[PDB]
Nucleic acid binder design. Sequence first.
RNA 1: GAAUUUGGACAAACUUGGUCAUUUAGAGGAACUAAAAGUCGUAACAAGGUUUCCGUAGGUGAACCUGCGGAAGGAUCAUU
RNA 2: ACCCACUCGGCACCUUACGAGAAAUCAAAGUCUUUGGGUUCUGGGGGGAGUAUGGUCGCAAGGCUGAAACUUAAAGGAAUUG
RNA 3: GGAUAGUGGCCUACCAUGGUUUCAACGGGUAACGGGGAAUAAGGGUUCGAUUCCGGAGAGGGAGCCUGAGAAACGGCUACCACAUCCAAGGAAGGCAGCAGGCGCGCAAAUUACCCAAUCCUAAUUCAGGGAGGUAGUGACAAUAAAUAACGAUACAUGUAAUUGGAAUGAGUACAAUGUAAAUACCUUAACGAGGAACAAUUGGAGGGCAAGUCUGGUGCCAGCAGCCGCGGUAAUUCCAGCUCCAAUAGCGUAUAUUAAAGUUGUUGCAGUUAAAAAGCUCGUAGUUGAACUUUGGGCCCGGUUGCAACGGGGCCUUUC
RNA 4: CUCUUAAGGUAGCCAAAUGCCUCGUCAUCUAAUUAGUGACGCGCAUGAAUGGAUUAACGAGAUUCCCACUGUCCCUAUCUA
Lengths: 25, 144, 185, 53, 258
Amino acid sequence: MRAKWRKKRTRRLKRKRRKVRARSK
Amino acid sequence: GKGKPRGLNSARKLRVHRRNNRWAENNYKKRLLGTAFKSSPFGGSSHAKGIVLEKLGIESKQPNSAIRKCVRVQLIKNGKKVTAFVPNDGCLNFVDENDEVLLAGFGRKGKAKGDIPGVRFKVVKVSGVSLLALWKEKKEKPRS
Amino acid sequence: PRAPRTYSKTYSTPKRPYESSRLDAELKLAGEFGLKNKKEIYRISFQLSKIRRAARDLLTRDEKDPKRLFEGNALIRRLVRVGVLSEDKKKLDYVLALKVEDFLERRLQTQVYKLGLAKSVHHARVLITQRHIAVGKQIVNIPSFMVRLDSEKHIDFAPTSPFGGARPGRVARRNAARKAEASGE
Amino acid sequence: SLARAGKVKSQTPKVEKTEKPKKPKGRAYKRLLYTRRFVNVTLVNGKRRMNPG
Amino acid sequence: ARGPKKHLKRLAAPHHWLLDKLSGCYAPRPSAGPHKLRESLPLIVFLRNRLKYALNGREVKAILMQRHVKVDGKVRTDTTYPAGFMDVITLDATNENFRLVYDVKGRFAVHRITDEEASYKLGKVKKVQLGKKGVPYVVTHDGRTIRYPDPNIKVNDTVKIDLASGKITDFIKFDAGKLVYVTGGRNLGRIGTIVHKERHDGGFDLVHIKDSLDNTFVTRLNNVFVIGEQGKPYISLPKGKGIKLSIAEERDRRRAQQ
RNA sequence: GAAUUUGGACAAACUUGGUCAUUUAGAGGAACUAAAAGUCGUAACAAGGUUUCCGUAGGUGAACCUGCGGAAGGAUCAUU
RNA sequence: ACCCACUCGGCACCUUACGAGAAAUCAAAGUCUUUGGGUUCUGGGGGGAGUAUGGUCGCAAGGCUGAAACUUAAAGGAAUUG
RNA sequence: GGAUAGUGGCCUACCAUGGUUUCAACGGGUAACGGGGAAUAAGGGUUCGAUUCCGGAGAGGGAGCCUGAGAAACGGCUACCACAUCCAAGGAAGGCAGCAGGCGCGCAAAUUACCCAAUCCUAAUUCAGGGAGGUAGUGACAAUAAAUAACGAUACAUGUAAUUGGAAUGAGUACAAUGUAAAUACCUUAACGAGGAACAAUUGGAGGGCAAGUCUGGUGCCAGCAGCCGCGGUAAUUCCAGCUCCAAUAGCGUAUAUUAAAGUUGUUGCAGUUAAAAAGCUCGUAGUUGAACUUUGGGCCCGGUUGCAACGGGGCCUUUC
RNA sequence: CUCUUAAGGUAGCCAAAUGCCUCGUCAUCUAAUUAGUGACGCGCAUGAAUGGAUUAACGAGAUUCCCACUGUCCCUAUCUA
Ligand SMILES: [K+]
Ligand SMILES: [Mg+2]
Ligand SMILES: [Mg+2]
Ligand SMILES: [Mg+2]
Ligand SMILES: [Mg+2]
Ligand SMILES: [Mg+2]
Ligand SMILES: [Mg+2]
Ligand SMILES: [Mg+2]
Ligand SMILES: [Mg+2]
Ligand SMILES: [Mg+2]
Ligand SMILES: [Mg+2]
Ligand SMILES: [Mg+2]
Ligand SMILES: [Mg+2]
Ligand SMILES: [Mg+2]
Ligand SMILES: [Mg+2]
Ligand SMILES: [Mg+2]
Ligand SMILES: [Mg+2]
Ligand SMILES: [Mg+2]
Ligand SMILES: [Mg+2]
Ligand SMILES: [Mg+2]
Ligand SMILES: [Mg+2]
Ligand SMILES: [Mg+2]
Ligand SMILES: [Mg+2]
Ligand SMILES: [Mg+2]
Ligand SMILES: [Mg+2]
Ligand SMILES: [Mg+2]
Ligand SMILES: [Mg+2]
Ligand SMILES: [Mg+2]
Ligand SMILES: [Mg+2]
Ligand SMILES: [Mg+2]
Ligand SMILES: [Mg+2]
Ligand SMILES: [Mg+2]
Ligand SMILES: [Mg+2]
Ligand SMILES: [Mg+2]
């Protein structure tokens, strides 16, 4: 996959991980 | 210049730069981080005894064939479960489930050897007697 | 505990195990000099490498420098005494230009053969191994002996060793005791 | 898939040895090799060979 | 480490004893005495390794307990008595007197002397001090205190000691041009004449010595021992007279015996 | 002059709490790798059939698509 | 204003390369095994991964810093003929 | 001022507000005791150092203390904690990281042996004591030397054959004697103790790297080998074997670690356009680095070292100590 | 691949003060939990200023657990006005 879209997918994953970690405490 | 300080009083920068850049070396980084102790089921040791748990046939990686007859072993030292190849023509019949085997490295310091996927240990003794000395008819396994 | 016991290795294996020309040269030397294994050539080349290293260290020094003078004179004296360095090559450069055969020549297994005391180098080897050769008033049963160029005039048989004196041997006695019967009586 | 661990070794004929005179171990063996190799025995086949065919 | 050590492991002994390496684990630890631990030479070492009279330490103590050996006029039955520099070792059985002096290699040379000069010994004045009741005294290199010393005897001078009354018969004064033995350092065992003394207030006194062969070596004042003037040593010098030939001329002297 | 005894300093040790470190369990979630000639398409390599790529932003089963600015590593070294 | 010649500084360009380079090419990418003018920053096979974690900045998006386990005998560069 | 043997925030009282730090303090980690040293090494280095010597610390974890010159001692005591022995239940006694030896842990390490004769140590001491130490036992840690054969005859074309002969010896074994503290063993030796001298050498390999087989049989993408590249699918020089051959050899292989190879850590000495790598750009502190210039040049001596020369000095003048 | 709508519930969130079935299922909490909490989600009938999700602080709001504390209780007794 294109490096740009790999980076975009990884950033979306990072956002989801941040959101899950935020909902947890 | 050459991109590095040459001045007579540049020794601190030169040695600090060497110290920083030595961390890009596999061996230096592994040794200083102590990977062999935390990781590396053999706690930085050459051999480790363990208890067989299961016989397993793993299909050799492409382009090869001929599933390789390894054994799952639980190490007495720390308790981890490692897959160990049983090297000879046959020589699986001399190792039994729930039997004690001495394991050695596979010669590659990790990075499993050959076409055997994910297997980086080999059997050297079983029940206290050499696997090679059981392949050859010199000795015979203690009864178990 | 008691002071440690100093000990050193005496040989060095070659860096390349399977160089065919080096293997053939070693086998040539072993066949010519009746050597048991490659380790003897290894040991002689190790001695020669140490000698060459010392000679190089001295030759890099200034000439008439006292250390060079003293230690090079000592090394040359030792080599000419052993007979490896010839009489007209006392310069510390011929020390560098020495060879393995120059040390293999002074072996007692080679001197015994070249003195006619043995029919071959292997005859010389077994004769030294079997206590048949004496250097002075002393039996020497070691093939590698490095004759001191004065023992050369004295390498003869022992008063023991029934080729140069009193006794007639061991199997001769049993063969005589059985030839008594073989005579009929 | 186990239970095939001897499909060659076990099912291969048990040819026995051949009793021959012992080799002269040691300096004698070095001498044997030296004569065999450096007296120019008929083993050349152009340049050099150490086995027949 | 909880107290004074009583053992002296071999390879820890002073090297100038020429002790065998693989004899045992231990060396004779010099008992407390006149000279020092390092600069001493035990009677066992001098009787079993320098003269071969005894073969073991048992035999050394056998020789000692019958009052044969005598260090500086007294019996000294101590097996490991620390005899040192300028000491007189007289034995009446095998009547002969030695003076412990340093050869040019830095070992305690066996130096036979006659009774007419073994009567006395030399001593380097370690200090001049007023004692209780205002009585002046001198302390010498061997740990001797001598009261009412000559008012002109200063530090670093040498005094001739009667060795039977223990009094000062004469004294040589440290000055440029007197015969000095070297009793320490690299040049331990050399003999020469004082040429110059560098002062170095606070630091260490240095002295430049010129041997008979005009070799000039400098050394610390701590280990130079005045032994008289040039050509008139107040004591008898050992076989080498502290010349310090180089290895080349030593080998030459050796090969001069064919 | 023993038992005992007052007050000190030195203080083990225990309890509670705090803190740090290292192992470790965990429903579930979300990745990576390996193997697998599974499914879906064909995004890239030819102008790869919409040139590709970078940053950013949004969208879509998935590769990806699209806007804005940039690069040629372009498919143009070129219009006095 | 232009022409001619010179000059200093600048954007570049053309030819040739003593020279350099794996080559493409390069007046610097030269003056480098005949290796040292000064100095800062960065890299150490390919992935995992600019990921996880901690810190810090940011309103957020994100930025800066940044592993490891594990995996792998190639990945990659320039050029040649098809 | 107290306390100490003594200096000293060592402690106390009062007072001041200092002391360390990017030239890395402080904190964290160490599968870190430090050093002498060890391995490897063209040079530079890299790695290691629990361990024969030196220094330190500890005697299960802490703490306290008696005696004494010297201990915060542990084969001394006191207490607590954790272990743990005995018991007639009331009580009492402990500390192998001394020498052996056991368990446990593990990949991983020896005899519950003899002796003070040596080395030395201790005492009141020439005598006693010493698991310090020495001696032997186990021991392929490592190191040294180097048996497994040598020489004839016959046939065949210097070499081939279970064609044969006479010698030599120690591996062993063993009277004694030496050695030893008493032995053992070594050295020295009476007699014995070589003929497929069975008194029989192994460990790994034969595709390449890498020395050595299109040999024969077996297996048929199976079994397996293979550090890597690969070899195995009915034609296997690579697996299992036989023969032959190669390597090292009383040693050889395997695993891990490390060193060289690695100029793949680069100070010597790497690379950064495109292979990994020049910060988007500029300023800027520490750091590193930083133009040139001040007695040069004549002359006279003495004296060295090597072979009149060369090279090295020291001393005078020349505006000069 | 179909039928089909204006559009077919998106981002989120949930047995929630919204889930009938239902005391849902898994985990945690307890000796035991229709409670609480964390997850899951074809969700009778969640969901975007009819505001969605979350939120430090605040609350005589609703709720669960823990420590303390106690006559709430075991199991009652006694005293004063
Ligand atoms: K294959
Ligand atoms: Mg496409
Ligand atoms: Mg396209
Ligand atoms: Mg298209
Ligand atoms: Mg990398
Ligand atoms: Mg390409
Ligand atoms: Mg004070
Ligand atoms: Mg260390
Ligand atoms: Mg430690
Ligand atoms: Mg150490
Ligand atoms: Mg340790
Ligand atoms: Mg120590
Ligand atoms: Mg202690
Ligand atoms: Mg213990
Ligand atoms: Mg204690
Ligand atoms: Mg003890
Ligand atoms: Mg003790
Ligand atoms: Mg022990
Ligand atoms: Mg044999
Ligand atoms: Mg023998
Ligand atoms: Mg084969
Ligand atoms: Mg080959
Ligand atoms: Mg490189
Ligand atoms: Mg690229
Ligand atoms: Mg790049
Ligand atoms: Mg600056
Ligand atoms: Mg300058
Ligand atoms: Mg939805
Ligand atoms: Mg719901
Ligand atoms: Mg809930
Ligand atoms: Mg409840
Ligand atoms: Mg709306
Ligand atoms: Mg609503
Ligand atoms: Mg309110």
